[PDB]
């Protein structure tokens, strides 16, 4: 059987990589996946990060801090889902 | 906090403008696309994920891009739901 | 529309060819694989996306690459639903 992990999305400019992976890492995540992609809003020069925590706690600092620090001058979205993963597993 | 739809279609590059353009069409507030490769029944295709508050603009984009590229193109597509925040 | 769901594989690059042979001979009628970077415990690494009919079917899956892989590699596998 599975346990319940929370998966944060944050899609930003490219320029931030190296600071919200610090943000990430500092806050206690476990790991990150960052994907190049590319978009519009309101080429792949976009990073999706996907952070997975078992921790919703975990996810809401890590939002609201690079919410805080980035949204109002860089072009961000962020979202957040649960995903089922194996009890073995550590998140 | 508030839920949002999350529309996915996996298709080939070349559509990249034609479904940006009913994406953006629609009234959805943008879109992301990822390079992607696979393989199914029929790197190679685009990844989009568009986000949009009412499921009802969600199907609407699904529709015609299903209806104008499927039983031509290489093409999938599936909608779940996200928590975001306003 | 429809409930399926969605197997989730982050594994590293050199895992592609035997991932993608378990995902097929398993009986998944296909897959997407997008290039990642990343961290754990720079596009070094790949992510599979499976679509399933079944959740059984995700889980015999997920338990073949991980019984084969998990100990000796990055991997990280999680599961989720959508309506196609
Ligand atoms: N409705 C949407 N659906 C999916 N992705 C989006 C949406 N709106 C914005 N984005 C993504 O967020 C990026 C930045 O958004 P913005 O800050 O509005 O420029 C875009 O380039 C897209 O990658
Ligand atoms: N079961 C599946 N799970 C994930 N992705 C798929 C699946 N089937 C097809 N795809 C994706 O959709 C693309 C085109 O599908 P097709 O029209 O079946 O060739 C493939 O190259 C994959 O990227
Ligand atoms: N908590 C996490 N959230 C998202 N992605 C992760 C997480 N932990 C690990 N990863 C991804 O999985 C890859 C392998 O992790 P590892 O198995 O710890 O080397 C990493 O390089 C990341 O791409
Ligand atoms: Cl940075
Ligand atoms: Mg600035
Ligand atoms: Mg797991
Ligand atoms: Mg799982
Ligand atoms: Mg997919
Ligand atoms: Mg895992």
Same mark, same amino acid.
């Not at 490219?14 to 610090?22: A, R």
């Not at 890492?25 to 206690?28: C, D, P, R």
């Not at 078992?54 to 975990?58: F, G, P, Q, V």
């Given at each position: 059987?599975?346990?319940?992990?929370w998966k944060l999305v944050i899609i930003?400019? /490219?320029?931030?990589?190296?600071?919200?992976?610090?943000?990430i890492? /500092?806050?206690?995540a476990?790991g990150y996946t960052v994907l190049?992609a590319?978009?519009?809003?309101?080429?792949?020069?976009?990073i999706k990060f996907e952070v997975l925590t078992?921790? #919703? /706690?975990?996810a +809401?600092?890590?939002? +609201?801090?690079?919410?805080?620090?980035?949204? +109002? +001058?860089?072009?961000?979205?962020?979202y957040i889902s649960?995903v /089922?993963?194996? #009890?073995?597993?550590?998140?």
């Open positions: 059987s599975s346990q319940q992990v930003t400019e /490219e320029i931030l990589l190296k600071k919200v992976s610090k943000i890492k /500092e806050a206690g476990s190049a590319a978009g519009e809003g309101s080429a792949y020069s976009n078992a921790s #919703r /706690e975990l +809401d600092q890590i939002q +609201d801090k690079v919410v805080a620090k980035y949204f +109002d +001058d860089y072009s961000c979205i962020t649960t /089922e993963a194996l #009890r073995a597993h550590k998140f």
